[PDB]
Design a protein around this ligand. Sequence first.
Ligand code: BCL
Ligand code: BCL
Ligand SMILES: CC[C@H]1c2cc3[nH]c4c(c3C)C(=O)[C@H](C(=O)OC)c4c3nc(cc4[nH]c(cc(n2)[C@@H]1C)c(C(C)=O)c4C)[C@@H](C)[C@@H]3CCC(=O)OC/C=C(\C)CCC[C@H](C)CCC[C@H](C)CCCC(C)C
Ligand SMILES: CC[C@H]1c2cc3[nH]c4c(c3C)C(=O)[C@H](C(=O)OC)c4c3nc(cc4[nH]c(cc(n2)[C@@H]1C)c(C(C)=O)c4C)[C@@H](C)[C@@H]3CCC(=O)OC/C=C(\C)CCC[C@H](C)CCC[C@H](C)CCCC(C)C
Ligand SMILES: CC[C@H]1c2cc3[nH]c4c(c3C)C(=O)[C@H](C(=O)OC)c4c3nc(cc4[nH]c(cc(n2)[C@@H]1C)c(C(C)=O)c4C)[C@@H](C)[C@@H]3CCC(=O)OC/C=C(\C)CCC[C@H](C)CCC[C@H](C)CCCC(C)C
Ligand SMILES: COC1=C(OC)C(=O)C(C/C=C(\C)CC/C=C(\C)CC/C=C(\C)CC/C=C(\C)CC/C=C(\C)CC/C=C(\C)CC/C=C(/C)CC/C=C(\C)CC/C=C(\C)CCC=C(C)C)=C(C)C1=O
Ligand SMILES: COC(C)(C)C(=O)C/C=C(\C)CC/C=C(\C)CC/C=C(\C)CCCC/C(C)=C/CCC(C)CC/C=C(\C)CCC=C(C)C
Ligand SMILES: COC(C)(C)C(=O)C/C=C(\C)CC/C=C(\C)CC/C=C(\C)CCCC/C(C)=C/CCC(C)CC/C=C(\C)CCC=C(C)C
Ligand SMILES: COC(C)(C)C(=O)C/C=C(\C)CC/C=C(\C)CC/C=C(\C)CCCC/C(C)=C/CCC(C)CC/C=C(\C)CCC=C(C)C
Ligand SMILES: COC(C)(C)C(=O)C/C=C(\C)CC/C=C(\C)CC/C=C(\C)CCCC/C(C)=C/CC[C@H](C)CC/C=C(\C)CCC=C(C)C
Ligand SMILES: COC(C)(C)C(=O)C/C=C(\C)CC/C=C(\C)CC/C=C(\C)CCCC/C(C)=C\CCC(C)CC/C=C(\C)CCC=C(C)C
Ligand SMILES: [Fe+3]
Lengths: 325, 51, 102, 51, 51, 51, 51, 273, 255, 44, 44, 44, 44
Amino acid sequence: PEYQNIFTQVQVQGPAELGVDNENNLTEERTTGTGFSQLIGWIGNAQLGPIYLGWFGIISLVTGTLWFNIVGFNMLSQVGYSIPEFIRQLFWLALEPPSPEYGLRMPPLDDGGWFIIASFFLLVSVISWWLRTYQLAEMHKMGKHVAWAFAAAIWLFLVLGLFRPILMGSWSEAVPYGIFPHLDWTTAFSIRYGNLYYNPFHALSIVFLYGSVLLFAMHGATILAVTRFGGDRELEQIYDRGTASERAGLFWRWTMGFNATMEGIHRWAWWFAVLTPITGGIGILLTGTVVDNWFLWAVEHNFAPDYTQDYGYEAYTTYDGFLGR
Amino acid sequence: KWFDEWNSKNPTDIYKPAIVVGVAGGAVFAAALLVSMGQPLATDSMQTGPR
Amino acid sequence: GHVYANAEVGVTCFTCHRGQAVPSEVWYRIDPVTENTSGWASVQNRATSLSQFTSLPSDALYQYLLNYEQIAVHDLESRVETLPGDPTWQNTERTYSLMNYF
Amino acid sequence: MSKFYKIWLIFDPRRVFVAQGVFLFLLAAMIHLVLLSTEHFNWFELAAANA
Amino acid sequence: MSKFYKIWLIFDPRRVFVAQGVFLFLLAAMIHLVLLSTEHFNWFELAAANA
Amino acid sequence: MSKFYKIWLIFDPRRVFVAQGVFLFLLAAMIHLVLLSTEHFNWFELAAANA
Amino acid sequence: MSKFYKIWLIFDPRRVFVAQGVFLFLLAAMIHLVLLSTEHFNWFELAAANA
Amino acid sequence: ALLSFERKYRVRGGTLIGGDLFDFWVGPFYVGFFGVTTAFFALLGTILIFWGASQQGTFNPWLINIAPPDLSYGLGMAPLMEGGLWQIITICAIGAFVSWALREVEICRKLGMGYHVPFAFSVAIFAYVTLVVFRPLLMGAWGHGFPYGIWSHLDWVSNTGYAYLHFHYNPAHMLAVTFFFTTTLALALHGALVLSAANPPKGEEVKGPDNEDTFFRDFIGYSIGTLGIHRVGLLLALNAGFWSAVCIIISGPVWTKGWPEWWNWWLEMPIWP
Amino acid sequence: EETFFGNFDLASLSLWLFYGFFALLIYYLQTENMREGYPLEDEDGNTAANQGPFPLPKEKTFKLQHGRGELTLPGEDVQRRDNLALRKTAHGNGFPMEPTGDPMLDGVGPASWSKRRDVPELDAHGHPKIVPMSAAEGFGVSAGTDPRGLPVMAGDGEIVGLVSDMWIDEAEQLVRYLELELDPEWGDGKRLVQRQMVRIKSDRVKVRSIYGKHFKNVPKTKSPNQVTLLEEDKIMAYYAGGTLYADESRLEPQL
Amino acid sequence: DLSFTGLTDEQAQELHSVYMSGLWLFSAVAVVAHLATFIWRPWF
Amino acid sequence: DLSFTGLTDEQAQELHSVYMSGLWLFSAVAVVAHLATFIWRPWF
Amino acid sequence: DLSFTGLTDEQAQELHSVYMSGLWLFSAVAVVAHLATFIWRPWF
Amino acid sequence: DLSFTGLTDEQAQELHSVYMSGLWLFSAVAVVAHLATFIWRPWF
Ligand code: BCL
Ligand code: BCL
Ligand SMILES: CC[C@H]1c2cc3[nH]c4c(c3C)C(=O)[C@H](C(=O)OC)c4c3nc(cc4[nH]c(cc(n2)[C@@H]1C)c(C(C)=O)c4C)[C@@H](C)[C@@H]3CCC(=O)OC/C=C(\C)CCC[C@H](C)CCC[C@H](C)CCCC(C)C
Ligand SMILES: CC[C@H]1c2cc3[nH]c4c(c3C)C(=O)[C@H](C(=O)OC)c4c3nc(cc4[nH]c(cc(n2)[C@@H]1C)c(C(C)=O)c4C)[C@@H](C)[C@@H]3CCC(=O)OC/C=C(\C)CCC[C@H](C)CCC[C@H](C)CCCC(C)C
Ligand SMILES: CC[C@H]1c2cc3[nH]c4c(c3C)C(=O)[C@H](C(=O)OC)c4c3nc(cc4[nH]c(cc(n2)[C@@H]1C)c(C(C)=O)c4C)[C@@H](C)[C@@H]3CCC(=O)OC/C=C(\C)CCC[C@H](C)CCC[C@H](C)CCCC(C)C
Ligand SMILES: COC1=C(OC)C(=O)C(C/C=C(\C)CC/C=C(\C)CC/C=C(\C)CC/C=C(\C)CC/C=C(\C)CC/C=C(\C)CC/C=C(/C)CC/C=C(\C)CC/C=C(\C)CCC=C(C)C)=C(C)C1=O
Ligand SMILES: COC(C)(C)C(=O)C/C=C(\C)CC/C=C(\C)CC/C=C(\C)CCCC/C(C)=C/CCC(C)CC/C=C(\C)CCC=C(C)C
Ligand SMILES: COC(C)(C)C(=O)C/C=C(\C)CC/C=C(\C)CC/C=C(\C)CCCC/C(C)=C/CCC(C)CC/C=C(\C)CCC=C(C)C
Ligand SMILES: COC(C)(C)C(=O)C/C=C(\C)CC/C=C(\C)CC/C=C(\C)CCCC/C(C)=C/CCC(C)CC/C=C(\C)CCC=C(C)C
Ligand SMILES: COC(C)(C)C(=O)C/C=C(\C)CC/C=C(\C)CC/C=C(\C)CCCC/C(C)=C/CC[C@H](C)CC/C=C(\C)CCC=C(C)C
Ligand SMILES: COC(C)(C)C(=O)C/C=C(\C)CC/C=C(\C)CC/C=C(\C)CCCC/C(C)=C\CCC(C)CC/C=C(\C)CCC=C(C)C
Ligand SMILES: [Fe+3]
């Protein structure tokens, strides 16, 4: 068949690209040293490095390492410092939030103090990383879209861990640090407050998540299908329209009756992705503080379905009949 | 004695058989494997609520 | 009302015992399952013989089926005034462990 | 019936014979497998054992 | 008004005709279906009861 | 009413005919299926019960 | 009625014949299957029951 | 009405079947053989849904519910008012989806493009068919499919998840959820980077691909390129769909107990003391 | 919690506010995507009587690099073609157009090109972005099969020449074009093929879109060291038009 | 003279005559159907 | 005269004549079918 | 005369004759089949 | 005198005369195999 442009047929390699610079003097803080990986060169660029070292990046790295080490050493001490049993039960361990009886007060190290210290370090690390992503775009003389979309996810992060426990008045409302233990928190949160399906903001969040995955499938396929016209060079197509953009627009116009531009599709993508954590955080913040049972709320607002048939197995079959006796 | 027909008029012999072969050998036979992979373990279900 | 729920089904010795002096599936109290922990952190985060392959609390069957603690956790109105002492998501996890056992 | 030979004035024999051979095989194999998958016709019942 | 014919100097008749056809059919189907959701005006059920 | 022939100066028959062909068959299938979901007018079940 | 032959001045017969064949075969298969889905008109079960 | 550059692309030819019997446009929409079939199937399905709604007793969009038959009917046909309508609508929907994909193929052929979009849509079609055809066929009853209602098809998901107790412990569900989250994150980053290149602060010149490559190597130390990002996004979305289908198809016919129990192979390996 | 009236609480107010916001956002997003290709026209070239539900956006300005000036959109369609060898097949709207002469040589249908600028695309240094490999310092093949010297196979199975060079993108380290040297029996000079329409094997290079007799009419570059945007559009459109116009069986129904 | 569609005054009058005739025929059929239905099952 | 399709008056008259000839035959067949069905199983 | 397919009047008449012949033969076969089926197992 | 393959009437006849014998030999072998297998285990 025709070439489909999924893996590159042949690779070429030249001198390493050290990057652009301006009066801001970015070269001062950049590391020296690059590598080439031929395995990842089949799908994308092969060059590895260099990287930018600032104050925000170093602070974020140190605080994140501290948070990781605190969680890990607590998990190790919880098992008796036995390494084989630490490995055997890795997915089941966690560092647990404090008990409900302490409110917002500082608990003992045995019953949530380490949890609070680790949470403080993680918060510092994430905020420092956001500051770094803002500063880099400021020094490159570009727009601030990356920082604003990272801030939309940080909103749901903060609502889950900081704002809602303060509004409810207890640090015991936060999420435990563990793999199976945080999936237990998700299910228990859904059960405790009725049914999270009947939360309209959870439904809006699902709408936007599904839509973003659908949009990425569409955009990736469309750009790969017009690459024979040089379609992957999107910026030059924005500055000087070519036949790739026209064919890409006309496909969707003839398919569903309307289309986009080469620059306008990225606005659609940016909004569908960012709208997911915003609606999610609004939905989470309203639970427990305003609404305590979402199914009863749905019954009150008349969008809960009604069923006529009966419940129980004896209305449909017999115990002997199921067993085959 | 007709070698003056083949050498004079040449195409591709193996193109249509490759179609037949990628149709049955391909689709039909593999379908069998996939169905006969999960269905050998039959299951029965008991209803406890409305349809 | 329980053993004769649908038909005549009693209990004899050969219902818990099945030829053994000690019947199978008997349980003990194991509540402190991790070390260096004090409260809600002391009962759950471990795969034990009482937790049903999950990391849910191993405290159940001792507060519910031996002691008398409330199992229900739900609110019975769409909007209620939350008070301290009301059920939390940890009580919900304990009930979830009991229902897994059921 | 007497004029059935004019088929070779429509279809090229070279590309027909290879496809026909590719079809007759992949028919016989399917029939043999269908016979094997049954109990009464599996002949690996008198086989798979030596006294 | 005798000047109503000037609506065709603003709207294209080709698009208005299509829109009108779709609208009229959908409205008729909607009314016919609303009648059948009642007990007094469902003619199938009335036919069944009268026998 | 005597000038209704002028619709063909507005619409090309090539699109109109395919539109009408889709619409009429859709209508027929819908009506037959609606009749088949009642008790009084389901002829397949009436034939069985009458025997 | 005597001028119905002018339908072939609107639509190409080469394209009409293929579509008509597809439509007729699909309709025949659908009706046969609908008959097979009942009890009174399933001739595979009737043969088993009668003899 | 046409776009300013559209007329030179509207040529004749490139059809799988039909020729010029259906080769035209209606407004912006292209019509073909598969356009005709799509219209028929979609209209019949919608009208049948509304007939079922009228016979149910409610026209409320939140409350309409058309359900599959009981489990005692097996793989046979049910009465139309007790589950047969759902089966007819399912057949119509499958026909409509396949017709939509083939119409997309015809449009791709006429425009001279690759066939990536119909191939990507085929995976979503495959997930739907797994939900309504393959799993009920393996489980032995058409009544295992989800109902057609805006709020009643969430109750099906809830009850099916809680029938394996704790569904978060399904490993294939874990893989699918991870792929979904990663796809969304990648889409956000890609849109942001392109917009930031094309829309600098006021009074500044626009940027180029070198600038984008430099921002991401400074940011995280690696850049995937303007061609690799589209491949990666397509692959992530397709993997999400495929693993969703796998996770649902293993829950009924292959595993019967609760999902936490599956990890007993890890918890009891001989290598542990 | 209490209700203002009826069942109206904070959740309902938040929901209605989100509904209003989403309506405004949908309007903005649809309007931002109408900066190219408007207003609409009919099949005869005149402005259409219908223009839609959404009004046209206001103007925005770009500032280009390397002293190319400004770009304000929406504006006049500067990428428009002048004389198209096309004919109408109906007196109304909604029907296809028919080529007048040779669609592959006239650039219509899937062989269409857009009128881009007659200058090469530049990198950050201000040099032409795409360069032949013979004039790139320190570049070489690092993986895969090197296609230089291998023969080129046409779509009908004819050998037309040999691969003589590759044109690479220095900034992004990627191969963009393959350069061929035509045999005297199949034309004269050198031609370019985009990397996205070829398959490199161990002994040959295969091009399936066009036939052997179509290789002499591929558009040529003006200079042996660079290519402009117009030239690229004209070359890639030519190669893509063959997927429909190379053979009569590729255009008629497949059934 | 104002015209968005390119039509003329006389053309618009001629089109409107036939359109109104079709409307009146449709309305007459609907009136007869409504009267028959009212005699069959009154709703007032 | 107004003509979006390019047809003349006589061509439109011929086409309408044949079209109505088809319509009336379809309607007569449907009327016969409806009468037979009503005799078999009335709905009024 | 109006023609979109390129056929003439005589060719259209000649084609329609054979098409009608095929349609009538198909209908006759279907009628015989329906009669036999009704005799075997009557609906209505 | 059609020839979509470049053969002449006599050459096609000679080719068919060999094809038929090749088919009949396969038929005879299959008949004997089916007789043997039916003797092993009848299916009618
Ligand atoms: C108690 C509930 C259980 C649970 C029960 C289930 C069950 C059971 C299922 C999953 C499924 C899924 N779960 Mg889980 N799941 C739970 C909690 C979660 C959580 C979480 C806690 O955050 C997440 C993120 C998810 C997410 C997921 C995805 C991995 C997956 C969704 C399928 C999908 O996208 O296929 C997308 C594909 C499709 C089906 C779309 C098909 C589209 C078709 C082809 C097009 C239609 C066109 C349309 C008619 C046109 C209309 C528009 C026109 C204008 C008319 N689950 C809980 C714990 N989960 C589902 C799954 O994987 O099924 C495949 C599933 O069945
Ligand atoms: C039984 C389970 C309950 C349920 C319980 C919940 C709960 C509880 C929640 C979700 C939430 C969500 N649910 Mg739900 N949900 C259920 C079933 C489903 C189903 C389904 C059945 O199909 C689906 C598809 C979903 C889908 C979703 C998502 C749409 C949504 C998460 C938002 C998001 O963007 O996440 C993406 C996640 C984030 C962005 C989190 C923040 C991440 C930050 C930025 C990380 C920082 C970096 C890190 C600390 C450093 C790493 C170190 C590195 C190594 C360097 N739910 C059922 C009904 N659902 C969430 C929500 O918003 O609800 C309204 C939520 O809280
Ligand atoms: C999914 C997005 C996350 C991410 C990922 C990420 N980090 C990365 C990469 C990627 C994809 C690299 O390719 C690059 C790297 O070299 O990884 C091995 C790197 C890296 N960026 C880093 C920092 C970093 N980025 C961070 C952020 C993030 N980048 C995001 C959260 C963070 C966090 C979580 O806060 C940190 C700590 C390190 C993890 C690593 C350091 C790379 C560096 O210092 O310079 C470039 C590399 C060299 C010095 C030359 C080669 C040596 C390599 C470090 C090892 C591999 C070489 C081997 C020959 C190739 C094998 C293939 C590799 C792909 C593994
Ligand atoms: C629009 C919402 C979506 C989204 C967006 C989003 N996320 C983002 C961004 C954006 C726009 C960033 O710009 C930022 C980023 O850096 O992207 C590359 C990021 C990011 N999203 C992340 C995570 C994340 N996002 C998630 C979700 C989402 N992100 C949503 C779907 C999720 C989930 C649960 O779905 C997760 C888990 C990070 C990868 C990154 C933020 C990095 C950060 O804040 O790091 C802080 C630093 C530390 C805590 C230090 C950790 C120390 C480590 C223990 C070791 C050092 C790091 C090392 C490189 C790792 C180990 C490597 C080994 C080889 C040794
Ligand atoms: C991994 C693959 C992802 C994906 C990809 C994808 N979808 C696609 C495409 C691609 C690549 C297209 O090209 C195609 C398109 O044209 O998009 C604009 C499409 C498409 N995916 C769509 C929707 C969609 N995609 C979804 C998901 C996904 N799409 C995945 C996440 C979802 C969900 C639930 O997450 C939905 C709802 C459509 C907008 C579109 C194709 C729809 C279409 O045109 O169908 C033709 C038929 C009709 C016009 C209507 C038919 C009506 C039926 C006959 C009756 C109703 C039956 C139905 C079962 C009832 C359901 C009731 C509910 C309450 C449950
Ligand atoms: C860079 O590149 C890219 C682009 O480019 C620059 C792009 O743009 C895009 C595209 C992306 C976007 C535009 C972003 C926004 C997209 C989304 C949010 C995705 C979600 C989409 C939707 C919610 C809407 C999708 C709508 C659908 C599926 C419905 C549309 C379909 C119809 C109305 C029916 C289609 C018509 C047919 C089949 C023809 C009619 C049939 C006939 C037989 C004709 C005969 C006529 C009749 C029977 C009657 C008349 C018919 C009419 C009028 C048709 C209308 C129907 C009615 C009922 C009135 C991408 C990805 C891209 O990466
Ligand atoms: C029960 O319900 C279900 C759905 C399960 C069904 O089973 C439904 C089934 C159907 C609806 C079935 C429908 C079946 C049909 C419509 C069948 C139709 C069959 C035919 C029309 C068959 C035709 C066969 C013709 C054959 C075999 C012709 C052979 C011809 C030749 C071998 C001669 C070759 C020609 C030559 C050499 C030409 C000479 C060349 C020259 C150049 C002169
Ligand atoms: C009861 O509630 C529910 C919802 C269930 C319903 O059932 C509701 C139902 C409705 C609301 C139904 C509504 C139905 C209609 C509005 C139906 C309308 C039907 C028609 C207008 C039918 C018209 C048919 C016309 C035909 C068949 C005309 C011509 C056919 C020909 C074959 C003529 C061919 C012409 C040629 C060849 C011309 C060539 C001449 C030249 C000179 C080239
Ligand atoms: C019960 O309810 C449900 C919904 C289940 C139903 O079953 C409903 C079903 C329907 C509503 C069904 C409706 C069905 C129809 C409308 C059917 C219509 C069928 C036809 C019009 C069939 C026409 C067939 C015509 C044929 C076969 C014609 C010709 C055949 C030939 C072989 C002629 C060959 C012609 C030649 C050679 C011409 C060559 C001439 C030259 C000059 C070259
Ligand atoms: C009870 O409550 C609920 C909600 C359930 C309801 O049911 C509410 C319902 C409503 C509120 C309903 C409202 C309905 C309307 C407002 C309906 C209006 C309907 C019309 C105005 C219909 C008009 C139809 C006109 C027609 C068909 C006229 C003419 C057509 C033609 C003449 C076609 C021929 C045209 C030609 C030849 C023009 C060409 C002429 C030339 C000179 C070229
Ligand atoms: C011991 O062995 C070594 C050394 C190798 C190790 O270090 C091993 C380490 C491990 C094996 C570590 C394993 C770690 C995990 C599996 C961690 C899993 C973590 C999570 C799933 C965490 C989720 C966290 C948060 C969630 C879900 C939401 C929100 C959180 C927050 C917003 C947190 C912020 C907290 C704040 C703001 C409170 C601060 C309080 C103040 C008073 C300032
Ligand atoms: Fe992109």
